[PDB]
Amino acid sequence: MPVPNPTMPVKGAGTTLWVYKGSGDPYANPLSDVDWSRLAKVKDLTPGELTAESYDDSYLDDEDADWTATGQGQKSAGDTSFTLAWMPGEQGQQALLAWFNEGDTRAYKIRFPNGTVDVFRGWVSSIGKAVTAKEVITRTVKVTNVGRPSMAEDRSTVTAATGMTVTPASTSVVKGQSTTLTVAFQPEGVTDKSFRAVSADKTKATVSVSGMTITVNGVAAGKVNIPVVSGNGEFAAVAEITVTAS
């Protein structure tokens, strides 16, 4: 894949930011940074929790009601945490101290062992001296929200192909009327029941499969097209129904 699969390869190994302010794109290619500098180490890191607020905006379901005086607060979030470590010998906690003086938004990247290297932005939400015990100097900083470049159609739809031997109606229907495409089957040596035909156009038509028939409903004008393919291509049949403009 690229990133998304549900496997558990925990966390750790101490790789961490990797700050930048630079000039360029802070949400697309983060690997063009000229500032690109290690600050320290990580002990381990919280998940990426934004979190939220994220009002509603208070729907109910009480008293009807007349007007009546709603509110909202939207203070977005929620500051995102992680736990640092540093060794005397590593050089960068002074540039964390400089962040307390600076007060500004600094961008950064963190390697995950979870299959990504995500981009962060944030401000100095905890600073100064840190817990020391087994010589590592350990504390936290808390940070902010990210862009989203994710599609949902592509990646594509699965094997919708429990086909059947359909006899097509192939005949015009009145606008808003339903019609039936008869199902034959010969399931020799097997005796199936998995069959489940799929319409091409759902915008202007719809279909229900029950009763040993395909009920196609002419929701709007033109052509409704149902391609019935079996399995891995061992059978295919195409049927349509034309739908009136009135």
Place this chain on the structure above:
Amino acid sequence: MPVPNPTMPVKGAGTTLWVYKGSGDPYANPLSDVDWSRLAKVKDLTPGELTAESYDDSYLDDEDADWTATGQGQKSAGDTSFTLAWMPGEQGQQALLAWFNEGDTRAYKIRFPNGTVDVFRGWVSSIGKAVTAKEVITRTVKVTNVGRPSMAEDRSTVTAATGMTVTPASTSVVKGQSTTLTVAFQPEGVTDKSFRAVSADKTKATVSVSGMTITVNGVAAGKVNIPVVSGNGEFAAVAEITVTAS
């Protein structure tokens, strides 16, 4: 929309006047000003409270009474407030000090985050040195009344379309007489009760809907016209009653 919707995106962000005296229209397009100059900053700004006086003119409901010696005061308002800030480095508080010397009516515009950029006029109702604490130099000025360009028919009336299958009376009535238009209904699979027919002309006629009938009242001569449309256009019927000139 344009401006009017009931959402709460609070206030602030320090944008402020933007004074003019110029020449042109001080109540229609305020964005043709050649004087157009920032004075300072705003900390935040009061709502637009005029306020009022706005007498009555003292109706009652005591002693009948003979003549008897009423008064009025009408001193309109009421001076409208807001809270300024300024930094040494910003240049304009000297032109606020000049307003104390000048004494005159100055026009201005203020950006709101409330979806508008309203036009103000007013005079120097507070001046000189201001409260300083966190280096901003903060005070107030208080100002005056605005024009109104708002219609109420347009924006138009809502879906008055809980129709019914009416049988029309379609027959002349005497001037000032009432008449009945019978209601049939077939509400299959549903069993409604929402039905509520609407007259076109209310100037010279009126209608009451109760009792499973439409009582149309021939208030003045000519035609009274009742168009009964259902829902989204799934049924429509038109009925009229002619009303005598005598």
Place this chain on the structure above:
Amino acid sequence: MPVPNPTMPVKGAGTTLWVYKGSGDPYANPLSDVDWSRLAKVKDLTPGELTAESYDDSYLDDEDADWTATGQGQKSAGDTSFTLAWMPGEQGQQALLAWFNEGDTRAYKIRFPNGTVDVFRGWVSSIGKAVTAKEVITRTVKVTNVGRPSMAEDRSTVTAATGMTVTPASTSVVKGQSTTLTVAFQPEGVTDKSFRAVSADKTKATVSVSGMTITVNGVAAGKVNIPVVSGNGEFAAVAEITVTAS
């Protein structure tokens, strides 16, 4: 900067006046004083509130009206406050007591932690014994108005440089007539819409940008000059329109 930026470094730390009467400039360089003497301590100090009066001079918007008998009061202000402290061991409250006898206007300077060291003048608006509790001897004095040396053009105007590829009209217009400068654009890999050209001379001409064109209006005679520069200097084009003397 020099002083003006909107940061909050609160107040306190007990540094305070620093009186003078001397001879020299009481509003430009206040650091040439030969009188220059600490009086005491400050607990903390009110912002610099003058305040005002600052009449108007009562414009309305009632009764038309014939002549009719207005007034004014202009009693400028408004006396400006601050809260003193003193320790037995500090030597200067006796010279505050002398101020009660003297009755006169005394000049002074106060260090702020707000990035300035502002100059004051005033008179003894509260005197004698003071509140003691945690051994500091604490009270107030109230004082008066200051000069203003602030420019507004300089500091200069921001990056007015959302340029465009203009084809210039470059042709004389009649006095008071409008004319159009056509806009081309090739925004490859980007698809912009930010473009917003700026005239040099607004005294004798004006310009509106809408409709995918630049409408330049020949308000008075000579040349109107529009320099269109993009961004950081990646494109530039200069266009003019000559305007008739009649």
